[PDB]
Amino acid sequence: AMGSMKAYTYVKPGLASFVDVDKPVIRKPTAIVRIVKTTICGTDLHIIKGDVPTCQSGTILGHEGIGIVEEVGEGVSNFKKGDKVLISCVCACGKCYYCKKGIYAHCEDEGGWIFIDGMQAEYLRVPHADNTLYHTPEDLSDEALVMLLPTGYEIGVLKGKVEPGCSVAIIGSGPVGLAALLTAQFYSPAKLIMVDLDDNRLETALSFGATHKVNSSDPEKAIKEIYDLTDGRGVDVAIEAVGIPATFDFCQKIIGVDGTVANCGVHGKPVEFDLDKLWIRNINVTTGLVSTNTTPQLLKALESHKIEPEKLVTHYFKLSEIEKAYEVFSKAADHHAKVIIENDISEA
């Protein structure tokens, strides 16, 4: 039709559909972006399953991407038509109680993690464009820019207080765990211990710069092994990158005196916190939703080629083949699979 675009929409628990929808338009004076490349997040799989029921039926999925500005409102000053830009997963009005703190995850004025229609479509309405878009450096690859990584860094690495010479364990060697692994190396920890059940993912973790792998198939033997690597003291940081009670439980068994369990993942159930044992251990437990306030610092730390996040990307698809992209991602272990999805539909 006319004025329409293609988009991947959530329908109901167990059903998403590549369909025609209206092209978005400017609704407020603070942009419309043409998506160039996007990806899928584990949370998108959860939405389709029905485990994020605040996602209304018909919503366009996805909250990761780069694109090209097509139109801006009267109140947009630092971006114009034609600008190649990165879109953060979090919208920030820049003025409210939480934006003034840099906690864009909890912006109170059409803010936070809302990608409203998301990025698995041809065009995207971006609220608060001046605070949600970033000009992209020409030195970085598209695959690395779509990864902008801030989840692993802000929620796994910074809240965990990784520092040179400390001992880190990362629980869960899927995409968010690997992203935390890459950015934890900005702080040169002595030990980066990847813990997982799958040996293929652990082998990839060593490729990405983990110093040791521990297979959690025998939990007791893994706990022993981690205490053996830390001279009986346990780790200074345990990054929980899976989001189930078992991984949270593992983290609380290996954390040492003064250490931090940094939770990254969504949890769908409450967990049993062993305060009877840990009240005396001087430990911390942190949570958070990414804000992306560090995106400028990560851009700087990537143009220098400290780490190369483009190695998170393993499979390439066209937007019109987004159904296939979901099939590969949801069965990532079968394919040794992050995917990148390129807009093969839109014209300039």
Next chain:
Amino acid sequence: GSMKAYTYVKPGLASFVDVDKPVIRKPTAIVRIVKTTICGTDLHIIKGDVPTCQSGTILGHEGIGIVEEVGEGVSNFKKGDKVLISCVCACGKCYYCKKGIYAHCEDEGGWIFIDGMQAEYLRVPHADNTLYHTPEDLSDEALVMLLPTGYEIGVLKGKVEPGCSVAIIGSGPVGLAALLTAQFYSPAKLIMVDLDDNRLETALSFGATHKVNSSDPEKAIKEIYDLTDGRGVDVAIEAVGIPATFDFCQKIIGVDGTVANCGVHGKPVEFDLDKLWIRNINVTTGLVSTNTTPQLLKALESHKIEPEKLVTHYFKLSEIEKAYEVFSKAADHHAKVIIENDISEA
């Protein structure tokens, strides 16, 4: 060569008995107790909750005294010094002492008060790191309270800062200590939460800005959201140590806030990560280290707060069973107690 001491006998039993006077055992002090007090942990010990505590062990880990003898490796304290004794012993040389985390010292350290302070005399390991000289403008009542548990584990781990909103769950002694020292950082709201209105009136008189009665938890929760613009508190200090108080804290805590747990817990708790993974919160725990005691002594110069009002009743060492009587039924007596050594001679 004997002294009197209050000892843990068996579960449900403690008694005022004659025991050996402690002697120097390591080159690193003997102290004559002047005044001591009772901790809530001493009641848990007598009940049998603290199982590592051997039978016959002298109770108590709080007090001030006069140095009686120092070993030949003690260099900064000498016979006749009037000194505060910290509840935590610190070797000063190990992995954790080098970090200032004295609660986990690896060399006869951490919280061990071995024989305790509810006696005439006390062997003090690592005297140079465990004793502090007493300044001149603080009463004995203020000194025995040295407060570091509320400050290190509640206020500092909770990240109290000027203008922030704080709730303290539990208006018992530790909660009150956290309420006094939180005022060093000038929070805009200090909300005391408890079941007892009398303890909430005392909290008000100690400088709390609001009282909230938690006898109906849901109304209490809604009340605290109304006080904080619907945002919840920046700091929730848990000073009771049961699952229901931890749960109350985790339900009132706001975005970016810290739930600071200082209370000993005996049971695991349900932690609502399904709700709180997205709220950007922190939960802290810890055993007091007393690395802030020097700074607390200095911050008491500003005289912004008066910790000696934590003491409500006075007893002599000889009648210490009477002191325990009053403290274990603290609500019935509107009751911290100060126990003074009437037995020893100077």
